[PDB]
Design a protein around this ligand. Sequence first.
Ligand SMILES: NCc1ccc(CNC(=O)[C@@H]2Cc3ccc(cc3)NC(=O)CCN3CCN(CCC(=O)Nc4ccc(cc4)C[C@@H](NS(=O)(=O)c4ccccc4)C(=O)N2)CC3)cc1
Length: 241
Amino acid sequence: DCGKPQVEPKKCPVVGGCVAHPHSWPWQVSLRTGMHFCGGTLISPEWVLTAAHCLEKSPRPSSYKVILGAHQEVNLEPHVQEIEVSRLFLEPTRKDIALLKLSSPAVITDKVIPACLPSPNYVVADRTECFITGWGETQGTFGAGLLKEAQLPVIENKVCNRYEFLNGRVQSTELCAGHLAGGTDSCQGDAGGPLVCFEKDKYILQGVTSWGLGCARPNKPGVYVRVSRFVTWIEGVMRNN
Ligand SMILES: NCc1ccc(CNC(=O)[C@@H]2Cc3ccc(cc3)NC(=O)CCN3CCN(CCC(=O)Nc4ccc(cc4)C[C@@H](NS(=O)(=O)c4ccccc4)C(=O)N2)CC3)cc1
């Protein structure tokens, strides 16, 4: 199954946001060199989707290991799965997304479950509230060392591209999300991680955390790779590899 967590997530009462209910984001992975540096999303037992820039340092699959089922970043709880990577696939048109093929398939449990993929070309609607998760910088917000989440509204690209916001920087193959007043956002260390949206009864991976003009700054929503524009490619890679 995909996108349905066995442990249900909770909304809040990553900069700002809140600590996630443990194991409520079971597709969240930690990409490591043993130091956490990026996030990723399990999309199938043997496939993880992340950001290409997370792999800029090394083109060798051996440089990387994936931690699945975690909540704590450092003291990795017992049942965590640590799997090596056998192959790296950078998106072929230099977009900031990549696939990692795991050496062995992750075992699906109550704490390790893949997120679902969207249909091709779907466009998350303006104002849709989605969630981002990760173990990255908190910029003086609490939660360091534990998996955090933030619920953010999508900002349609036409708006996001205005001078007041990102000023033409955003591609159709990207989406924007964030609270314009600032204070809550994904940040460095969350890159490559998921932006998921609840659709009917489960969570669909709609974005991959990519970049931003800072973190949690006013009028500067985060930019995510729009997964729906890469589903066909992803499917092809999975099928042929
Ligand atoms: N939710 C906020 C959030 C969440 C997670 C993260 C973590 N991710 C990064 O850290 C991110 C790494 C990176 C990603 C994509 C890249 C290059 C580099 N892609 C191309 O290389 C591909 C080639 N081009 C690049 C340029 N494109 C045009 C549009 C454009 O200009 N895009 C920008 C602008 C600025 C940057 C990157 C990209 C550099 C910093 N921004 S920052 O302000 O300095 C900063 C300071 C402190 C904290 C955060 C950010 C930035 O985000 N790097 C066209 C294609 C960051 C932020």
